[PDB]
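In practice, a research group might receive sequence data for several interacting partners and want a quick structural hypothesis before committing to experiments. The following worked case mirrors that situation: the sequences arrive first, and a predicted assembly follows.
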Amino acid sequence: EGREDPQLLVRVRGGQLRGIRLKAPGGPVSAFLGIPFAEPPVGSRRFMPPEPKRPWSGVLDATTFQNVCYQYVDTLYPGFEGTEMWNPNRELSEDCLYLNVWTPYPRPASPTPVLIWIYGGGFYSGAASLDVYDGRFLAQVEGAVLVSMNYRVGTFGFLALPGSREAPGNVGLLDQRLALQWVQENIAAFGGDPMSVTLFGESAGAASVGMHILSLPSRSLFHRAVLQSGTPNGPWATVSAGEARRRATLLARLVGCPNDTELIACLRTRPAQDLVDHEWHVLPQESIFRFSFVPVVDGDFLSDTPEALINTGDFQDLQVLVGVVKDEGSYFLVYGVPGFSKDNESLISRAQFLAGVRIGVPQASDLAAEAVVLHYTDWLHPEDPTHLRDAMSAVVGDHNVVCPVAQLAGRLAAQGARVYAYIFEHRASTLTWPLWMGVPHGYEIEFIFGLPLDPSLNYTTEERIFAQRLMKYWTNFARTGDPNDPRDSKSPQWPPYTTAAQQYVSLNLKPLEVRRGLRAQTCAFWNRFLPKLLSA
Amino acid sequence: EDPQLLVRVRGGQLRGIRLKAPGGPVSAFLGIPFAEPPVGSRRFMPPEPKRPWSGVLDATTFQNVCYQYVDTLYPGFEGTEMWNPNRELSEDCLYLNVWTPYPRPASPTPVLIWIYGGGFYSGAASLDVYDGRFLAQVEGAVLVSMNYRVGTFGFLALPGSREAPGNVGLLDQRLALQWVQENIAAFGGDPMSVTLFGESAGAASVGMHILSLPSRSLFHRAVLQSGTPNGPWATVSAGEARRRATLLARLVGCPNDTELIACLRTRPAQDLVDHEWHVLPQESIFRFSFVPVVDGDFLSDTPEALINTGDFQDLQVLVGVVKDEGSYFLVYGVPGFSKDNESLISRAQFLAGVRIGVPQASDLAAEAVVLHYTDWLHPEDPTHLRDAMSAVVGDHNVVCPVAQLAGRLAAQGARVYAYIFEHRASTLTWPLWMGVPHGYEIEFIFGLPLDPSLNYTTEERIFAQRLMKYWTNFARTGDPNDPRDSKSPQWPPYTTAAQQYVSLNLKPLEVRRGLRAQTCAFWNRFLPKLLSAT
Ligand SMILES: COc1ccccc1NC(=S)NCCN(C)C
Ligand SMILES: COc1ccccc1NC(=S)NCCN(C)C
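A structural hypothesis for the assembly, expressed as tokens:
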């Protein structure tokens, strides 16, 4: 109002905003960062569902990222880029429910399809402000309207005493839902089309996307979904009400909080850091790829277990894109499996492999664990250290990601959904993790968001072209529900995943290759046999 | 009279017969008695040595076949009839046969002793596929084969009783082995170089002689073709043998052990055979009612226990399998399988078939088998399901037991050689979907393709000669490799480390590693736990 462009001044339901003009390699983009979408969930509102942001007066400055939700900070490899890139990059606070919007500059004069990013982090970490989630490239190159929101993690987002009024659980997912409702009402002010909203997320964010697919009140808030290396089904994304209650009760005892009302009231008096300092002490077994406070089967947000909901759900008018990276498990081994480190080749003995299986499959009986060991052992070389190391990675990746994804894709396809499946096989030339980890969990994200287009990041030219291809796949799917370009038949086609043919594509520097069966043989072990075994 | 055909053994004089092989004559001494006829009160009893005889005993023709069930699945079909008795049935059946080079061997010659198979309920040494003609003529071997009692007559047991102690059919084999030690030198054979070889139940028999101390002094090397003493069909516990014997007695109207066996001895042979199959505890295939029993005597413990703790240092063993061990048995009980159609089966038929092929499996173990063998890219393809049904039966009953035995023998001192036989005879009468069925390597080991009237291909003739050389080289030296040939390539010993075996087909030897390693880990390591826990 005076000297402000004014292509950066926008009004939303809550009031006026002032965004910022950012520089992307190919031109400018508009960014509206740190938009509050909820009342600060602090004090008496800790553990409570979010309340919509009450209107503010004057022009709110939306030129910088807001606080990151309070969370545990990783210190396994202090100062190491491979881990620090995921750590908070803004102040930790319980006052953290803000979202961000990237659009073309000038804003589009025509309703534009919207992408909503939901970050992962095992439901205990993450932030929409991380560099790998920078929406400026998708906004500039593909003309997308990209939105990303913070949501409460850890105890603050998922500590639950099911049935209580003061800690009903799943409030972190309700934070996400409120952001989705904010987009429905307000994204038109930015040139976005609320009738074309695609959710995409990775790890716990993909599991979050799946929970919105499975929760009725969320289905009216989006039209398509992308689940990258994560699912609502599987062994880590949810807990039962009984397990959530015992974990919340134990944590309370561990911070000096011995009726649900009095217990939660006492928890609300504790400092945020006190809860973070003990949240990892409530897991029932020594484990990797397990997180203390995750979505709970409350019979409300989730009317039943994700397994039961995907086994019996109707997904006719639903298009979904799902996939995995080549080495889903390797990242998690250095966080608790003896013998595994980023600083050596991590060749392990057979004994270390058996011990690792008990940690990677913590819920397994002795017989189930033995079944795993026999299945993954190479009986031509049962003691080879290199194969055992790679087998340990496959156990963790198959159990937690690949086979849950394969299960989800199969059920969704059988029950009306249009599914596209991929495996991501390119290892970034810039990767700082060792070679034995291969293509680890989470390292497709930087290519989807188009970071290789930033010339200062020293990616290769082939990786730049590769990123543009993936951006086109993702935005084409967002636009049409089909990753294939409407008129580019020269390039090979990406067929839908079906129960009959089970076709998926490999994403690497070569053109698309069609393959059949997402670890079909191995995932029969995890998804068909092992349930029968454990229940006996 | 021909003096090459006159032989004096400890019992008396024998007269053999000059037979014609493709390349020249051989001396055949057929139907030599090695035991007193196990008839009347000697039914179910251990064998006794044959009493001496006067004059010259005629040994020019095969003797009777031990009384046994006769197959009627495909009447008149060559594929089944080639295994049926080709001489009259009789309980008076304990005779053996000797083939030698004509003239007699000038120096002591290694001896090959054949033990026929047939599920311990059938078989005979007089079958055309066991013709010692060619091995004697071409390789100069002294070949011996004996009849042993089968079915109830050979293995009905009331363990602990005096009148039916069990395993008498194996004692028949052992007595023939003793006869060879005592007499084979009169034929030019070397009793200090005796090699046992057998197929199916015959191979299991060979293995039990390895695991029974009194037998170990009677041979020096062993070949086990598509059979093992360990595994789910070759032995039964004392309690199960007692159950099956008592049930058969009930079915034939009988009636303490003495009184029971006394009434069984009054029954005509066919009465017992008529109810032989009615005592199995489950509907099944590749299961036989009366087999060797873990008596604590002939077998001091289970074959599994004995191979796990035995000392096999100075032992050489040759083992192997055919490409499609299970196909033969499917047409004998599994719905959806016939020699006359391609036997394309549904998935439901596959689950039903698995309960018959793994009769002892719980519902959960059966599910484990189904899920392991299903191709989850084509879970309902009938061709794959049919071939998977054959693989289940073959792996469960032969391939993995063999891999188990080979590993334990190698680990505990034995020199082991392993093979897979992958050639389908041009003359085979079974359908193509059966592949290389159980038992159809034998005609090549014995050298039948060297007979031009049988219309084998000239490549199969050359192939047979190769196999006869492997087997006789192993008999001579404990090593199947030709000590004159140079890297064709070499047949390496099987070891727990490298797990090397060779493919036997029309192409030169190809060394491979791991005998269905992943699948036999399932059968040999996991499934016992799954059942040892229910
Ligand atoms: C954003 O998420 C990821 C990104 C890259 C690799 C792993 C994860 N996933 C988790 S949970 N990272 C936190 C550390 N934990 C393994 C203990
Ligand atoms: C001599 O042995 C064989 C030779 C060829 C194929 C199978 C067998 N084995 C058995 S047991 N044949 C009897 C019939 N059985 C299917 C019940």
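Before designing any experiment, note the following. The first helix of chain B runs from residue 78 to 81. Chain B is about 35% helix and 15% strand.
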